[PDB]
Amino acid sequence: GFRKMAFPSGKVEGCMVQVTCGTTTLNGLWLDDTVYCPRHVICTAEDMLNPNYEDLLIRKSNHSFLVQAGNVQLRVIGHSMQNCLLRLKVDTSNPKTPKYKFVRIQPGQTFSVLACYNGSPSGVYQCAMRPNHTIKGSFLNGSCGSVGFNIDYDCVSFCYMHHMELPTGVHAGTDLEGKFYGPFVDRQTAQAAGTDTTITLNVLAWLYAAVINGDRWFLNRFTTTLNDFNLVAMKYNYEPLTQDHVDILGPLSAQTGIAVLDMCAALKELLQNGMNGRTILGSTILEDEFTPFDVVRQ
Amino acid sequence: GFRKMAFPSGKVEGCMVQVTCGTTTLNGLWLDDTVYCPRHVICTAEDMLNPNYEDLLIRKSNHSFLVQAGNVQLRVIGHSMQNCLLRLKVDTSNPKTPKYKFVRIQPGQTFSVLACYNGSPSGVYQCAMRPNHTIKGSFLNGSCGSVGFNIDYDCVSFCYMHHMELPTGVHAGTDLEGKFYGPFVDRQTAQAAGTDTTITLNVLAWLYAAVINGDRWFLNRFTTTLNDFNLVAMKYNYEPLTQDHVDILGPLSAQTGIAVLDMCAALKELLQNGMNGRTILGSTILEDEFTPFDVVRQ
């Protein structure tokens, strides 16, 4: 019974606000007395290609910022720019602020997204940071500033602030210090992501999950070293497997009785021969956004 | 970017409590001054096969119910049984109760699930009521009493309270009046649902979703009648299509400009010739847990 599940979103929902500059508007994140939002909000339509953010910013007063939390207008007391984020100081502390921290997630790791429009939460889903530092999100116009997060105990680890859609339909954004994931810049120019690779640790977890679910037609009796598997994997644009990843897969290996390198030998034959029309957990494509942690939990 | 998306769960998270009788514990739903929970909580481990709930309930008083809303304890002031649910009147009106309704959902309709573990939310995901009145959910031990719901403009429509997992790994529960979906009874005995069917109206809406998102390869120049299509549907364990179904699909037909019976002809070809190892909206099976409403909203 494996499926993508999001963390409950309530702790983030009480932090979503709307931020408007003139006629340009997007989502912002209200923690304590600070509102975080993409600095792109200070662009007019003409500014959106080739903006000079330091010029646009110095030309702004606090009153230019219209910050709305539901029915309530909050007043910007002060404002500073931090990389590609604005930090708006505001006259009131959010009573709903959860315990939180700002983290920089790593490729292969998952998080929940609260997709938001004009400061209003719309939906929640899980997705993963890709090796090429984009995310395959589900985002419409007005979603700029929507936030990605994980929850451990009662602490929300914010890790993603949505900025833009790339021409291929994938998405780019920043951490909550405003540093972009990947080689992107916040301008309305056509930017291409590098070629993507498959998250091997997660494909391996998925194969383990399929074995736990009773499907083992892809297992074989070949052996491989880590080095020889990594050489094959890179020829098929799969990420090489580190020994840390082998350690991460330890619990699934012990539960199923299939040594990590033996599952790699299964994967190797799948990569070289394909699936001869067979399916795994019902699909002909190897899923790579289900983490070992997700498998173990479900 | 088209994926299953759950409603933001904040309004439901504020209603989740833990209910314990002796050592038996599960989740309850706290609305105004009432906690709703499965009556199975009044079972000792020895009672859980073939219990007599009328017998067990008369032997308890308000004191025997321990209700915890996080750190706070709520005092039970009264109690009664309604079908397979207990209604516990409490001390305190939940200050966080949203605008809400209780609805009974029909087969093929979708809802979000807030999976909970002994009173604490842990995950959220979208699923559907199967034609055979079970749910293909993701529920672990301790999830009894978790709730399913939809949201329409600040009003939460509760439609499902989780009770149990069947031998096949699917799930069974009640509406918020305590009446089970399907042929099931709340006791720890092996029970089976009827044979399931694929939700034709949902597959068709998902094919429209694909057309809108650019996936056009499965279309053909052909067309079919309702009666001939249903001859194919029965042979492949799909639900028969009705004119109401066709009427429901009108807006999706208009937006894409593909007549409904034209999409049925494409579906008939997909069922008969299988897919070519190609994908529709990223998946390699015909998805049937998106309603026409879901496709529009996304």
Ligand SMILES: Cn1cnc(Cn2c(=O)nc(Nc3cc4cn(C)nc4cc3Cl)n(Cc3cc(F)c(F)cc3F)c2=O)n1
């Ligand atoms: C299809 N899609 C998927 N994700 C996105 C996110 N996204 C967005 O929501 N808005 C953007 N531009 C704006 C236009 C506005 C018009 N008004 C009146 N107000 C607006 C505010 C914004 Cl932010 N963009 C484009 C974009 C946003 C950036 F932050 C950036 F650095 C470069 C960009 F090209 C956008 O991608 N849309």
Ligand SMILES: Cn1cnc(Cn2c(=O)nc(Nc3cc4cn(C)nc4cc3Cl)n(Cc3cc(F)c(F)cc3F)c2=O)n1
């Ligand atoms: C793996 N899984 C998938 N869904 C479920 C839901 N589920 C559940 O969470 N609990 C159940 N039995 C209990 C045992 C308890 C032990 N303690 C200390 N407290 C307990 C409370 C419960 Cl409810 N069940 C079984 C079950 C629950 C019912 F409500 C019912 F009518 C029949 C049943 F067989 C269960 O399925 N677990």
